[PDB]
Amino acid sequence: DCEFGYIYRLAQDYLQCVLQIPQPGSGPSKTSRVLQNVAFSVQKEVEKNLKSCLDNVNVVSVDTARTLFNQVMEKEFEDGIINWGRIVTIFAFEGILIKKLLRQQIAPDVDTYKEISYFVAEFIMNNTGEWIRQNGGWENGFVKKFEPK
Numbered sequence: 001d002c003e004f005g006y007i008y009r010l011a012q013d014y015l016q017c018v019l020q021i022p023q024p025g026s027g028p029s030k031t032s033r034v035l036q037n038v039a040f041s042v043q044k045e046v047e048k049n050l051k052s053c054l055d056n057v058n059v060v061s062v063d064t065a066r067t068l069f070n071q072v073m074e075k076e077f078e079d080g081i082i083n084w085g086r087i088v089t090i091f092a093f094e095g096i097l098i099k100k101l102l103r104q105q106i107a108p109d110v111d112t113y114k115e116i117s118y119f120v121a122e123f124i125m126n127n128t129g130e131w132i133r134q135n136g137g138w139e140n141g142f143v144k145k146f147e148p149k
């Protein structure tokens with residue numbers, strides 16, 4: 001679960017959850033199901049608290065979304081501290097960007113949404129991957145902290 005493949009699937013699962021397009025074969029993992037729950041809760045909070053801010057930007061391509069996402073990541077982790085709450089926050093932001101991109105993309109390609117999932121997993125992997133592993137990974141760190149009590 002420290003690998004890219006795992007984090008990519010978590011980011012793509014979150015996207016399909018936001019887009020209301022779930023895959024039929026089996027469904028998401030307990031880990032993804034716990035994540036979609038806590039990340040959606042955060043996303044709605046960020047949507048309300050950042051209302052004015054969001055309604056001003058225009059996400060017209062995957063490249064425009066990569067830039068906005070990097071900008072948000074730059075200010076989310078500027079103090080250098082990582083915690084599960086901030087990791088959940090990354091997922092919430094890709095959800096905000098996919099909603100905006102569905103609404104404002106110049107060439108509405110359906111194969112662009114999986115590119116968001118790619119640069120989200122790349123960011124998580126390269127910038128928080130080590131912290132995640134040392135804190136228990138997804139199945140012994142994230143789930144144990146956020147699964148229903």
Ligand SMILES: */C=C/C(=O)N(Cc1ccc(Cl)cc1)c1ccc(F)cc1
Pocket residue numbers: 052053054056057068069071072075076093096097
């Ligand atoms: C409204 C401020 C701004 O221009 N930001 C750009 C932005 C990036 C990503 C998303 Cl999902 C919406 C808007 C901005 C917002 C929040 C930040 F933490 C940094 C930059």
